[PDB]
Design a protein around this ligand. Structure first.
Ligand code: 408
Ligand code: 405
Ligand code: K
Ligand code: K
Ligand code: K
Lengths: 251, 248
């Protein structure tokens, strides 16, 4: 019904205004705090280094930003020695496109690289959908056999909560602990990464195996994408199950 | 069947190796070209400015990077205003997650986790709602074509293929070509960068290398284009999905 569609639209628009107000209340004080710090750090630098003009300072910052924007860290020569487009790293980038996560820490800079990325996404994202539906069909049988073992609506609510918590331990809690010890992040940053990854939001502020100073094994990046594949397939199979049940409720 | 699941897995793994090899062939020469430039720009700066040490240079670059990472441009003298924070909220819900703006505060990260968990399904309900209404529009249009070939007897699969190609092209003009032209004139991007942005936005990949508005009605109209754009193409995938389930 269109009456409920317009109703959900109001709930969503109110939700974004609510969200927007909460985010600005939490972030704007720190944003203003950082803005004051960078202005002071720059001014104090020019005060200590008289041989540098404010104009040639700007040019150097721009050169450093353009380098980082390209994907090359302007910090040291040793950090530059590693590549972001190696056979392994470019395989994970491909996966980052296909899963619609799109971190953005690495992005195509080449005009041709952008053209191929457009075509790669258009044909590649449905190809992943087919794989995720495939694992989603097998997991649906696993879920179906587990509910058949156990009011049908109460059983189904108890079942779904258990499956959600099952995935929350196996694909959310356990891998977050691994990232806390491997990537050296805080308890929050680790959970935050896992959540932002599996929701396919992928901000890119936290990316697994991204620190130049980290001596990460060769099996790390493929196992991370494997965790993404099993983690996304699992919670997709759960949403498919809730969707199919809601369609039965409507009819 | 599990035989076809393992088959799709091989196709996908081969696709990522293929993709990975193509991306490195296209990007690694420019990546090495940039790496050489930054090393030279820094070294040439230190030779011109002798009063600056190589270490207190790194410290300044780090301060500039930490500022940009926080969302404050270290070039010249807000990203969390009522309007901008509304669009950020909309970026989370649509799963686009550009990343040009991201929660820095420990509490801001906590709220972002909870906001996504409850907010993304809420969008799914809205997108399904528009997807249901558009499905009736598509369904009534295919039922019109099938009424013509009732006595002419033309395979239902052929009718369904020509119709879907038309709906895909309809969305490609209205929500892909036309808005890309607007971004080319407004944001001042190149013809490629404009199409690339629209594609990376509507696929919800959202790299964040290109973000719209980075007038007051611009940011909400951009999210409105995103809402109708995602909903239209989600209605088309829903239609192809429902038909494939009937085929199985
Ligand atoms: N959640 C909707 C996903 C859907 O979105 C589109 C559809 C079409 C396009 C276009 F035309 F290429 F620009 C981009 C994104 C989609 C993404 C990748 C491949 C096919 C369809
Ligand atoms: N495959 C994308 C769907 C997405 O999947 C999840 C599910 C759960 C989680 C998490 F919160 F971390 F447990 C993160 C992502 C989802 C988000 C909100 C509700 C249900 C599912
Ligand atoms: K993203
Ligand atoms: K996404
Ligand atoms: K994304």
């Amino acid at each position: 019904k269109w009456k409920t569609v317009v109703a959900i639209f109001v709930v969503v628009v109110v939700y974004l205004v609510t969200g927007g107000l909460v985010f600005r209340a939490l972030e704007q004080p720190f944003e203003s705090s950082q803005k004051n710090t960078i202005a002071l750090e720059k001014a104090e630098f020019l005060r200590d280094h008289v041989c540098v003009s404010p104009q040639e300072l700007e040019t150097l910052i721009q050169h450093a930003l353009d380098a980082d924007n390209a994907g090359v860290s302007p910090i040291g020569n040793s950090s530059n020695n590693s590549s972001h487009w190696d056979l392994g790293s470019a395989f994970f980038f491909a996966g980052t496109v296909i899963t619609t996560i799109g971190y953005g820490n690495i992005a195509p800079s080449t005009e041709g690289g952008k053209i191929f990325c457009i075509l790669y996404a258009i044909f590649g994202i449905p190809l992943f959908g087919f794989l995720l539906a495939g694992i989603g069909d097998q997991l649906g049988t696993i879920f179906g056999k587990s509910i058949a073992r156990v009011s049908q609506t109460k059983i189904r609510v108890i079942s779904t909560i258990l499956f959600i918590l099952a995935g929350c331990i196996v694909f959310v809690t356990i891998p977050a602990v691994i990232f806390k010890y491997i990537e050296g992040w805080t308890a929050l940053e680790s959970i935050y990464f896992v959540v932002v990854t599996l929701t396919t939001v992928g901000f890119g502020d936290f990316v697994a195996g991204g620190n130049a100073g980290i001596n990460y094994r060769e099996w790390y990046k493929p196992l991370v994408w494997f965790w993404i594949l099993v983690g996304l397939a699992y919670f997709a199979a759960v949403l498919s199950m809730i969707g199919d049940w809601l369609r039965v409720l409507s009819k």
